[PDB]
């Protein structure tokens, strides 16, 4: 969940206030309130987002030639479903025996 949480954080921080910070210098229309928006969300947010993007870019780069990140690809998960099928068949047989017993009443 590490990479998933990192991607979620990057997505939530993708729409930073840098794109909306283009109306911060015009806040001085009362004297020669929210003037603090021109400092924290002017360029520091964009700088942090770019730093995070660069960090995410420089990963291990595992995938080189073929098909990595496998892990099912194989055995008795199939036979696990088969055992579930055996459980179902036993259920059917128990139901037939119960019907026979009911008829035996």
């Amino acid at each position: 969940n590490e990479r998933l949480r990192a991607l979620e954080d990057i997505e939530r921080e993708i729409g930073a206030i840098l794109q909306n910070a283009g109306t911060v210098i015009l806040e001085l229309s009362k004297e020669k309130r929210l003037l603090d928006r021109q400092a924290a969300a002017f360029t520091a947010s964009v700088q942090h987002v770019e730093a995070e993007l660069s960090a995410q870019i420089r990963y291990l780069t595992q995938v080189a030639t073929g098909q990595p990140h496998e892990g099912s690809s194989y055995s008795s998960r199939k036979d696990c479903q088969m055992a579930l099928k055996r459980v179902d068949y036993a259920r059917l047989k128990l139901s037939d025996v119960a019907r026979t017993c009911e008829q035996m009443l």
Partner: peptide
């Protein structure tokens, strides 16, 4: 007496099988 005992054993086995299959209804929650 033999018929009564047979009926009793049949009812006991039926109840046991019923109780057994009933508790393992949704063993696989899935």
């Amino acid at each position: 007496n033999e018929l009564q005992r047979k009926d009793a054993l049949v009812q006991k086995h039926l109840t046991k099988l019923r109780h057994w299959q009933q508790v393992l209804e949704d063993i696989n929650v899935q």
